[PDB]
Amino acid sequence: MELENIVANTVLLKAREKRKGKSKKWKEILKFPHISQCEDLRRTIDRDYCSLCDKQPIGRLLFRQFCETRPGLECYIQFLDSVAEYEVTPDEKLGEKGKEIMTKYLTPKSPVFIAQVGQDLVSQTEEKLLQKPCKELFSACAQSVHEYLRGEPFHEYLDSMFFDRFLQWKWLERQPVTKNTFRQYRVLGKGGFGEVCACQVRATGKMYACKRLEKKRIKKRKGESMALNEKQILEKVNSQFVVNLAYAYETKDALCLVLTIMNGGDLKFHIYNMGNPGFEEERALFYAAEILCGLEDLHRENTVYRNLKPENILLDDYGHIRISDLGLAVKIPEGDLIRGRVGTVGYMAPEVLNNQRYGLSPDYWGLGCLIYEMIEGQSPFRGRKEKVKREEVDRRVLETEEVYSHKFSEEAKSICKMLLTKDAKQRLGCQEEGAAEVKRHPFFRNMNFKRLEAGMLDPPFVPDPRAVYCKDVLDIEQFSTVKGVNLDHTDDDFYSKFSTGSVSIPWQNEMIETECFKELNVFGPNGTLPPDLNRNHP
Ligand SMILES: NC(=O)c1cn([C@@H]2O[C@H](CO)[C@@H](O)[C@H]2O)c2ncnc(N)c12
Ligand SMILES: [K+]
Structure with a gap:
């Protein structure tokens, strides 16, 4: 048994599991800026409800926590929530779960009565439930609600400390990514122009796979378009059964794609x-x-x-x-x-x-x-x-x-x-x-x-969990290290186009998943402005 193999594997396994592997100064690395610093982001951010209040997770969660302040909106949030439940209830109990929702949101005296839907739709959907249940029964109802939340409630979120707080988070999302952000672990595989490695974000401790694209190899094989295409494509596809791209940066020697980590082996x-x-x-x-x-x-x-x-x-x-x-x-x-x-x-x-x-x-x-x-x-x-x-x-x-x-x-x-x-x-x-x-x-x-x-x-x-279902690190094929190529400035453009930093929605999930967002996203007592958001004085 080569120790070069034992060590390579046991190191990876510790990381995979105190601090869930985070760095020690993560609270300072990810410290919110004062809201006064976010004036460029205040202007450039595109003001879309679904994006800022749904698609972008942190935007979504901050909006929900904001809806919890107005009692008149927390119900709509609980309604679309209840609909989520109904949309995953079995065809067997669809009719029943359809019944609790109905007695809860549609009677004029319902405790969580929501009036913004439309008294016509309640009856149209009521007959459909009396007839037969379908998971897409409340599809129109939930749509009718999204027509209202996107109106007045949306602009009210944008005016509050919660959207101001979202700008702070987006400031962190914008931060540059470098080799430092991550720590490299054992090699996981050879492929294409480089190698796939386990690595871990120092700040968050989240595990990824780092598909390295060695610059000299791209130049030597004219695979420039092939490497770039892979990057965009990994970005465009958003599927549960395809690796999702989280970061894409440049290093002194390679371009990198940070992808979901698959510990079960190929x-x-x-x-x-x-x-x-x-x-x-x-x-x-x-x-x-x-x-x-x-x-x-x-x-x-x-x-x-x-x-x-x-x-x-x-x-x-x-x-x-x-x-x-x-x-x-x-x-x-x-x-x-x-x-x-x-x-x-x-x-x-x-x-x-x-x-x-x-x-x-x-x-x-x-x-x-x-x-x-x-x-x-x-x-x-x-x-x-x-x-x-x-x-x-x-x-x-x-x-x-x-x-x-x-x-x-x-x-x-x-x-x-x-x-x-x-x-x-x-x-x-x-x-x-x-x-x-x-x-x-x-x-x-x-x-x-x-x-x-x-x-x-x-x-x-x-x-x-305690198995690395991969060839041992000393059994992984290597390249015939390319040498004598010299990278010209003509390629710095492509390197720039490729290195687009963090991917917006995935980065947010990391902060949510790593509980970084949970621990950091706090406010003054009694729901008051913290110092980072108060532009009147400290
Ligand atoms: N991004 C990738 O393509 C990956 C390649 N490997 C492993 O490294 C080998 C080289 O591609 C594969 O056969 C897998 O064993 C991976 N393992 C986990 N996650 C990944 N995203 C990859
Ligand atoms: K087998």
């Missing part, structure tokens, strides 16, 4: 480097469903992936999964196909192997590639440790068809072949239906996709 590892090859069909189904949901969301944004292999699918702490390394994805101009001989060997669709124009098709080819591999324990066109020169694998994918065993259930066998069809025209999901056509296949039977996309299905396999 699926390539769970298939070959743990227990018997592959895992039970139960496990394959759950993960395959989530991969589907991720691909449908990626395609909703009109974006292909082209890089689907187990090594780029990761497992989180609870057993859910997300897609990684979106550096091979491109957004498609609508009504056009692209020619690109890119991808990894044996995970390329026949169109991509023939340098033929394609659209969203090669993604469903990959979905089949993974499902077969999870259950069969090997690529559908390549062995386990099989040494094959690429030319043949290429041939096999185009000429030869896959082979199934008794391990495949009737449904598992079927969904593979329909996804592993050489003709892109007759490929499952590649029809106009899209990912819907796949959501049906009996393979995903008793797989309530609507309930999975919520997250109410427990993963079958739960990674143990």
